[PDB]
Amino acid sequence: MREVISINVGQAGCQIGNACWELYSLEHGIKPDGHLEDGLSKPKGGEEGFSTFFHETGYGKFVPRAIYVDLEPNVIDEVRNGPYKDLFHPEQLISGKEDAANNYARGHYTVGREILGDVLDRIRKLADQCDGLQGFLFTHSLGGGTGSGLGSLLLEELSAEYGKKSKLEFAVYPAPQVSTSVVEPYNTVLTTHTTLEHADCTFMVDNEAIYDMCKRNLDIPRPSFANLNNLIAQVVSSVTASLRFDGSLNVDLNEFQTNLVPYPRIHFPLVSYSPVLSKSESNSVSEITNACFEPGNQMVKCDPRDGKYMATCLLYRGDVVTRDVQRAVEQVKNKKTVQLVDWCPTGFKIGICYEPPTATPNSQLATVDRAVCMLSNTTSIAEAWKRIDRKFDLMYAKRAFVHWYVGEGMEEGEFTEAREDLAALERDYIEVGAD
Amino acid sequence: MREIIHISTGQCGNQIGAAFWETICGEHGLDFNGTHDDIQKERLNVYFNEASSGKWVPRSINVDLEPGTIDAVRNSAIGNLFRPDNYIFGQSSAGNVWAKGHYTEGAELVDSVMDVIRREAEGCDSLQGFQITHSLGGGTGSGMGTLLISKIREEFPDRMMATFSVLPSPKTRVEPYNATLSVHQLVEHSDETFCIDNEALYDICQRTLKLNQPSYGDLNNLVSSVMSGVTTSLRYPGQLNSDLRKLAVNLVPFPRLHFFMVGYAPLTAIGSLTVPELTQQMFDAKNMMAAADPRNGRYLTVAAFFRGKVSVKEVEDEMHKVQSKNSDYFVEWIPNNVQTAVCSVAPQGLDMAATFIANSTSIQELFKRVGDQFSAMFKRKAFLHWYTSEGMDELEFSEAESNMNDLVSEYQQYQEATVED
Amino acid sequence: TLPLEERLTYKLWKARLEAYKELNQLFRNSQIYWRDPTLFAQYITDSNVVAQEQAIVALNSLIDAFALKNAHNITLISTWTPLLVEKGLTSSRATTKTQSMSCILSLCGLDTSITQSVELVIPFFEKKLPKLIAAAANCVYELMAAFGLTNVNVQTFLPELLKHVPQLAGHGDRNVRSQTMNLIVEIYKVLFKKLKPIQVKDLHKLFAKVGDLFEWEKRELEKKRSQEEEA
Numbered sequence A: 001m002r003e004v005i006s007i008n009v010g011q012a013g014c015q016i017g018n019a020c021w022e023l024y025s026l027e028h029g030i031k032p033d034g035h036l037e038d039g040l041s042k043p044k045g046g047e048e049g050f051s052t053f054f055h056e057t058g059y060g061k062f063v064p065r066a067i068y069v070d071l072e073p074n075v076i077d078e079v080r081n082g083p084y085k086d087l088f089h090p091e092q093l094i095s096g097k098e099d100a101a102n103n104y105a106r107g108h109y110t111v112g113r114e115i116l117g118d119v120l121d122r123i124r125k126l127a128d129q130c131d132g133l134q135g136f137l138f139t140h141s142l143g144g145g146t147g148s149g150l151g152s153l154l155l156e157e158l159s160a161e162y163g164k165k166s167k168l169e170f171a172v173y174p175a176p177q178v179s180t181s182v183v184e185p186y187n188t189v190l191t192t193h194t195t196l197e198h199a200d201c202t203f204m205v206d207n208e209a210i211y212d213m214c215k216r217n218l219d220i221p222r223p224s225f226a227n228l229n230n231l232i233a234q235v236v237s238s239v240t241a242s243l244r245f246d247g248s249l250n251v252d253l254n255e256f257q258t259n260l261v262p263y264p265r266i267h268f269p270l271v272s273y274s275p276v277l278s279k280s281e282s283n284s285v286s287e288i289t290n291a292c293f294e295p296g297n298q299m300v301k302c303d304p305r306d307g308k309y310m311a312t313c314l315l316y317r318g319d320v321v322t323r324d325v326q327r328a329v330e331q332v333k334n335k336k337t338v339q340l341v342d343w344c345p346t347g348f349k350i351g352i353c354y355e356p357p358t359a360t361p362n363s364q365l366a367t368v369d370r371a372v373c374m375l376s377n378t379t380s381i382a383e384a385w386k387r388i389d390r391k392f393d394l395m396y397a398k399r400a401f402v403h404w405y406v407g408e409g410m411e412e413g414e415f416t417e418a419r420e421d422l423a424a425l426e427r428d429y430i431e432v433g434a435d
Numbered sequence B: 001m002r003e004i005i006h007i008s009t010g011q012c013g014n015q016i017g018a019a020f021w022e023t024i025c026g027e028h029g030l031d032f033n034g035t036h037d038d039i040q041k042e043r044l045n046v047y048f049n050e051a052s053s054g055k056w057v058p059r060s061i062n063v064d065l066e067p068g069t070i071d072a073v074r075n076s077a078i079g080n081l082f083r084p085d086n087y088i089f090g091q092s093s094a095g096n097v098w099a100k101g102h103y104t105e106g107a108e109l110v111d112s113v114m115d116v117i118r119r120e121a122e123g124c125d126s127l128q129g130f131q132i133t134h135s136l137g138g139g140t141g142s143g144m145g146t147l148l149i150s151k152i153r154e155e156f157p158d159r160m161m162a163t164f165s166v167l168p169s170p171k172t173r174v175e176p177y178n179a180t181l182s183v184h185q186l187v188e189h190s191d192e193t194f195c196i197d198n199e200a201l202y203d204i205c206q207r208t209l210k211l212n213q214p215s216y217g218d219l220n221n222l223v224s225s226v227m228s229g230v231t232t233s234l235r236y237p238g239q240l241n242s243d244l245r246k247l248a249v250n251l252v253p254f255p256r257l258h259f260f261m262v263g264y265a266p267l268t269a270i271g272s273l274t275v276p277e278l279t280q281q282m283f284d285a286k287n288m289m290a291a292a293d294p295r296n297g298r299y300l301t302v303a304a305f306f307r308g309k310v311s312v313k314e315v316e317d318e319m320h321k322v323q324s325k326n327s328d329y330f331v332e333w334i335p336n337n338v339q340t341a342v343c344s345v346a347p348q349g350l351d352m353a354a355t356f357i358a359n360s361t362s363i364q365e366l367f368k369r370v371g372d373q374f375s376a377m378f379k380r381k382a383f384l385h386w387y388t389s390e391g392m393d394e395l396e397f398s399e400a401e402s403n404m405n406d407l408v409s410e411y412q413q414y415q416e417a418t419v420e421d
Numbered sequence C: 001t002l003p004l005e006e007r008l009t010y011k012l013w014k015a016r017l018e019a020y021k022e023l024n025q026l027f028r029n030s031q032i033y034w035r036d037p038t039l040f041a042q043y044i045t046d047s048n049v050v051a052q053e054q055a056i057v058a059l060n061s062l063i064d065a066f067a068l069k070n071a072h073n074i075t076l077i078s079t080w081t082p083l084l085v086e087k088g089l090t091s092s093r094a095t096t097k098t099q100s101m102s103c104i105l106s107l108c109g110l111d112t113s114i115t116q117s118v119e120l121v122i123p124f125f126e127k128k129l130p131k132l133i134a135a136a137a138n139c140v141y142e143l144m145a146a147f148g149l150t151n152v153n154v155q156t157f158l159p160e161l162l163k164h165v166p167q168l169a170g171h172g173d174r175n176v177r178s179q180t181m182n183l184i185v186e187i188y189k190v191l192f193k194k195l196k197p198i199q200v201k202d203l204h205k206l207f208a209k210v211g212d213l214f215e216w217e218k219r220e221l222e223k224k225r226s227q228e229e230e231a
C-alpha cells in the first residue's frame, strides 16, 4: 500500500495534528489505544485508504504514521501524558530542551540544527516500514521559530533523501489577533523563501480567517487555539478524505500537483469549506456549493469572486447524489461566478466521497449529513503575501530585530534573498493571470 | 523546565530581592519556609528549587560586600527558606565607589559567589538565564554587580541576562559616577534591564499613596508588585512571553536599546475597578516609575500583563482601542508593538491588576539628566582620587560618558518617520 | 617594602602592579626570567586586570630583549601563548588586548614557522565562549598576515586548519563568522562546498580585491648587513 507520513513541526503543528489525529481516529473507528472501537472487527477505512495513514504494527494495534517535532518539551509532553498517550509510539514524539523562541534563525541555523539527526532517523525508520512510500504531509506555522525555522530545514532535508517522493504542506499563516511575536512577518517571509522549491502543493491556513469563522459561524466571542484547531482539522480531514476513503478525485498525493498546480512556484490553492454549523439544521448541495464562493468561508481571508482561477477541485462528502452536484455546479458556471483563466482547457473538476463527515463530540462543530470542500488555485491569494510583505518591509527598513537573527547564525543578506524571492513570487502571480 | 537564577547585589539589591521573594511566595502558595488553585504549583520550579522534602528553597543568591544588610534578611521572616550557603559577604563595604566593587574588594568576592551559582546551575534541568537585583547608585550593587554580569556571561554565553536596575536621584555625591559606569557595562552585557527611578518611586509613595515621609520599605513594595506582575508570564503556563528570550525578542528591536520603563495599576491605597479604568490607569504617567515624559516620545515595543478576575476579550478589546486613540505614541514601522497577556491568578488582595513594560524612547531623559550630572563633576575632575586610586582610569570615565551619550542619540534618532537606508 | 621577589606575588594587588612595572623598566633599560616561564605564566593571569595589564606589558618587554635554542622557545610558546589568547585576547581592555597579541606574535618570531604557534591556538575552536573562539580565529589571522606560510609544508598544515573551519563558519555568533571569513581571505592571499552558498558568493566578491619577520630572518639580514661593511 502507498503510505504517507505526516510530519508535524512546532506548537501549532503539533496541536493541529492533535485535532487531525483525533478526527482521523474517530473516522476510522480507532480508540485512543490504537485499537478498534467495540464491534468493528475492521477499521472503517481499510481496505481503502486507512492503511495509508495508519500502521498496523501488530494484530489489533493500529498506530498513525506520524512524527511530532518541537524544540520545547512542553507541547509534546501533553501528548505523552494525555488520553492519546498510547496512540503514538514514544519514538514518534521528539522534543528538545529549549525552543527557538519566536526566532527563525535558531530554529533553522542554531538550535534546530542540533535535533536534526534524530528527526531524520525516525522518519527513515518510518520510511523503511513502507512498501511504497508516497510522500509526506507537513503541518506547521510560519510564525514561531521552530515550525518556521526547523520546519523549513526539515522540508529541505526531505527533498535531499526522499527526492522522488512528493510533499504537501499545511502552513499556518500568521494573524495579529492571535500572534505571539512581533517578528512573525520576518519568520514568514524567510520560510516561504526556503520552502518555495521544497513543496509540491501548500495549503495556507490564515489564522485570521479561521478566527473570524469561529467568531461568526460558531458564535464564539473569543475563540481559543483549541477552537481554531477543531475547525482546521474538520477542513484538513475533508481535504484528505479521498485519500483515506472511496475517492473519485485526488486519490493520490501526486494528483494534487496535477490538478491544482500549473507551474511549480504557484502551488498555493485557496481552500473553502461548507457548512460550518454550531453544535446547537439540515442544508443541501446547492447551498454548500454557493457558500464556497462567499467571502466568509475560506482558509485565507480573500474574496472568492476576485482574481483569476487557474484550477479548481470541488470535493463533496456524505449523502451526496451526482445529479445534485452536476446541477449545483452548473448553476455556478452558468451564472458566471468566478473568472476562469483563458489558457486553461479544462475547468471545474468534481470528486465524491460517500463517507459522511464527522465532528468530534468534544468540539463546537455540528455533524452534517453532507459537506463540500473547494480547492481553488486563484491569483487572489497573492494578496496574503502582499500583506505580509508590508509588515516585513516596514521593520527591515530600519533593520529592526535583525540582530536577533544575525546573532543566531544567519547572514543579513539572507533577508534580502528571501525578500526578492517573495517579490518575484508576487510578480509571478500577476503575470500568470495575463495572456 | 527552564529554571532561573536570581542574584541580589548590595543593600538595595538584597532588600528588593527580599520583597520579591516574600511576594511571589504567597502567589505560589508557600509558607515562609516553603510549603490550592494548582496553577500556583505548575511553574513553581522556575524560581524555586525543589528540595527533597516537598519543600521549596528559592534559586536565589544574596551577595553584599559587607554583612550589614545581608545580616538583616538573614534573621527576618523569609530568612528561613533561603539556602544558608547562598549568603555571600565580605568584611568591609565599598563606601559608595564603583571602582572598589568592580576592581578591588568586589572582584575578590566574585569568585566565591560563582561557585554557588555554578553549583546551582548543576541542579537545573535546562536553566534559561539569570536575573539581578541591584542599585546603580552605590558601589557594591553597581560595581560588583556589573563585574558579576560580565563574568557570568563569560561562563554562560548563551543564557538570558535580565536586570532590575535602580536609578539614583538628586536627594553620595558620586551616584552619577557609579550609575554612568554601570550603564556603560549594562549596555554591553545586559539582555534586559528594567529601569526603576528612585525619584518616581518616591513621588508615587508621597503623592499617590500620600505617605508623608516614605521609607525604603514602601519604595520596595512597588518594586516588588511590579516584579511580581512582570514575571507573571514566567511563573504561569499557557501564556505569551514564557521565556526570558521570547520576551526579549518581542521587546528589543536593537541590541543596545534594551532599557525599559515599568508601570503598575492600581496604586491608590485608600485610608471595584473596571478593565477600561485599569487600562487608563496603566498608561497614566502618574502610574509610572521613571521621571521621564512618556507621552513626549514614542513606544518602540510594549508588553502589558493583566491579572485576576478579568476577561481576555475585554482586555484585548481595551488595549486595541487604546492603541487606536494613541497611535501617534506607537512607532509605525513596528506593526503590533504591543503584546498583551492575561493571567487568572490574582495578586491578592486585589481583584485585578496590570503591569506595564515599555521600550519607550522617552527614557533618554533619564540617561540625559545623569549624563548632565556626570559631566559637571568630570569637567572638574572631582572625586576622581577615590576611583582612580583603585586602578581606574580617566579614559574609562570619558568612555562611559561618551558611550551613554550615544545611547541617548539612538533613542532620539528612532523618533523619526518611515525612512529607508 | 622590599624585596621585589615577594612583592611580585604579595597579597595586595597594588604591590603586584608596581612590581610588574618595575620588572618592565628593568627590561627596557637593558633578572633572567627567560629561564623559567612559570614565573610570567603566573603574572599573565594576575587575577586583577589592572595589574595583569602590566604583567603582559612587561611580558612583551621581556621577550623583546631576546635575542637561541629552539627547544627552550617551544616551551615558552607552549606555556605563554595559550594563556595570552585565553585571558588576554578575550579581555575587554585596549592595552591588554593589543599587548597580549604582540606577545603572541613576537613569541612566534622565536620559532622557524607559524606551525607550532598555530597548532597551540587551534584547540580553542572547541570552546563554548564565542568571543574566545573569535579571538583564536583573529589570532591565527594575524599570525599569517605577519609572517605568512614561510617555511611551512602547506600540504600538512592547511588541511588540518580547514578541518575545523566549516563548523565555525556556521557558528551562531556573528563575530566568529566575521573572523572566520577574514581567515579565509588570508589563506587565499598566500574548502567551500561545506560552506553556505551565500557565504561563497560574498567570498568570491572579497577575492576580487588584491593588489600586491622571524628571529632568524632578522639575524641573517643583519649577518649580511654587518658584513656589508667591508670598505
Ligand SMILES: Nc1nc2c(ncn2[C@@H]2O[C@H](COP(=O)(O)OP(=O)(O)OP(=O)(O)O)[C@@H](O)[C@H]2O)c(=O)[nH]1
Pocket: A009, A010, A011, A012, A013, A015, A016, A071, A072, A099, A100, A101, A102, A103, A107, A141, A142, A143, A144, A145, A146, A147, A148, A172, A174, A175, A178, A179, A180, A184, A207, A225, A226, A228, A229, A232
Ligand atoms: N491554528 C493554530 N495556530 C496556532 C496554534 N498555536 C499557535 N499557533 C500559531 O503559531 C504562531 C506562533 O508559532 P508557534 O505556534 O509558537 O510555533 P513554535 O514552533 O512553537 O515557535 P517557537 O516555540 O517560538 O519556537 C502564532 O502566530 C499562532 O497563530 C494553534 O493551536 N492553532
Ligand SMILES: Nc1nc2c(ncn2[C@@H]2O[C@H](COP(=O)(O)OP(=O)(O)OP(=O)(O)O)[C@@H](O)[C@H]2O)c(=O)[nH]1
Pocket: B009, B010, B011, B012, B013, B015, B016, B064, B065, B066, B093, B094, B095, B096, B097, B135, B136, B137, B138, B139, B140, B141, B142, B166, B168, B169, B175, B198, B201, B216, B217, B219, B220
Ligand atoms: N529602592 C531602593 N533603593 C535603595 C535601597 N537601599 C539603597 N538604595 C539606593 O542605593 C544607592 C546606594 O547603594 P546601596 O544599595 O544602598 O549600597 P550598595 O549597593 O551595597 O553599595 P555599598 O554601600 O557601597 O556597599 C542609593 O542611592 C539608594 O538610593 C532600598 O532599600 N530601596
Ligand SMILES: [Mg+2]
Pocket: A010, A011, A072, A099, A144, A146
Ligand atoms: Mg513553541
Ligand SMILES: [Mg+2]
Pocket: B010, B011, B064, B066, B068, B069, B093, B138, B140
Ligand atoms: Mg551596602
